[PDB]
Design a protein around this ligand. Structure first.
Ligand SMILES: [Zn+2]
Ligand SMILES: [Zn+2]
Ligand SMILES: [Zn+2]
Ligand SMILES: [Zn+2]
Length: 111
DNA sequence: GTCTGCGCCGATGAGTGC
DNA sequence: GCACTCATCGGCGCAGAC
């Protein structure tokens, strides 16, 4: 219902449209109090601020290695679980990493 | 040159709750 | 209806192994 006048993407609420418009204005209201870097999204600032705390809180349940971000831990744990979420669209092969799947698909296309 | 592992982002989605 | 938090996932970059 809330459409963007500059790119035709559509949004559900005034708040999501206001946030999207920062993609076009470059507005970055949320500033890190340590290094001064600014962010368009408050949650991205909060994630960034974890870098300055030096607390690697997210610990791998298989090898105990610690990571600053939960998302970084989760990608790491795929090595242990065998999760291969990147599927070749042309054959049975499945891949841990998108880059590897992408290069494999390109080899199909070249043939 | 490719695969791997991982550190840090943008910008949208899901869930929650008013 | 609405905003807020945190997740999501591709992008980018880089170093090491081969
Ligand atoms: Zn737009
Ligand atoms: Zn900072
Ligand atoms: Zn691990
Ligand atoms: Zn394939």
């Amino acid at each position: 219902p809330y459409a963007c006048e500059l790119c035709a993407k559509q949004f559900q609420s005034p708040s999501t449209l206001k946030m999207h418009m920062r993609c076009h204005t470059g507005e970055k209201p949320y500033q890190c109090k340590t290094c001064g870097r600014c962010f368009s999204v408050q949650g991205n600032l909060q994630r960034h601020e974890r870098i300055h705390l030096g607390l690697k809180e997210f610990v791998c349940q298989y090898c105990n290695k610690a990571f600053t971000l939960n998302e970084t831990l989760k990608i790491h744990e795929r090595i242990h679980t065998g999760e291969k979420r990147y599927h070749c669209q042309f054959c049975f092969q499945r891949f841990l990493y998108l880059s590897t799947k992408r290069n494999h698909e390109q080899r199909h296309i070249r043939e």
